[PDB]
Amino acid sequence: GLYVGGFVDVVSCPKLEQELYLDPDQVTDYLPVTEPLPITIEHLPETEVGWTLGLFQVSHGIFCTGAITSPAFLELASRLADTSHVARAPVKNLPKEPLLEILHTWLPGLSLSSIHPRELSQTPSGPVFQHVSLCALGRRRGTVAVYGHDAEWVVSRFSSVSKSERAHILQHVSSCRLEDLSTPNFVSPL
Ligand SMILES: O=C(Nc1ccc(-c2nnn[nH]2)cc1Cc1ccccc1)c1cccc(CC2CCCCC2)n1
Secondary structure, eight states: OEEEEEEOEEEESTTSTTOEEEOGGGTGGGOOBOSOOEEEETTBGGGOOEEEEEEEEETTEEEEEEEEOOHHHHHHHHHHHHHOHHHHTTSOSSOSOHHHHHHHHHSOEEEEEEOOTHHHHSOOSSOSEEEEEEESSOOSSSOOOEEESSHHHHHTTOTTSOHHHHHHHHHHHHHSOSTTSOOOOOOOOO
């Protein structure tokens, strides 16, 4: 399996003219989000690679846990990890887990798409959040994303998340199962 975790940036209209990064306190009333949102790359809808497992308010911000489940993506990324000089160039030499290191390096940002704050003054009508994207650019408040084969290992890499908060996060990561979720839409260009 592949899991991803980290603190997110909250962004309205990502990659558009009206792009607006939100202070996390503007959306904490609408957390936690336990139901799965798509995980895409750089806010491109045709690059779904997995599903979120939880978005939680913790002390230092908003933490996301996700599962990367697309077999096409996993196979392609693993192959590039083992064969692509470009993918490996900016990573430490000869890592034991090249797929994890390449993802951590090339897609360090977690970006949570939100509706615009004007919708949050009142009571919003529909879903406040749309998706989480793995991003090469745009990280501000978010931390560098951690990729791993177990969810416990991934969350345990953030010393800024208490054992207590870790337990709360991992509680739901285990409750909401993955196998039943639909296959993400990513198509390998190879
Ligand atoms: O421009 C990028 N990639 C890119 C562009 C064109 C084609 C391509 N077009 N035609 N044939 N191949 C193929 C790829 C590789 C790709 C593979 C898996 C998911 C999306 C992209 C790009 C830029 C920044 C970050 C990333 C994330 C990558 C994730 C997997 C490991 C390597 C980094 N990718």
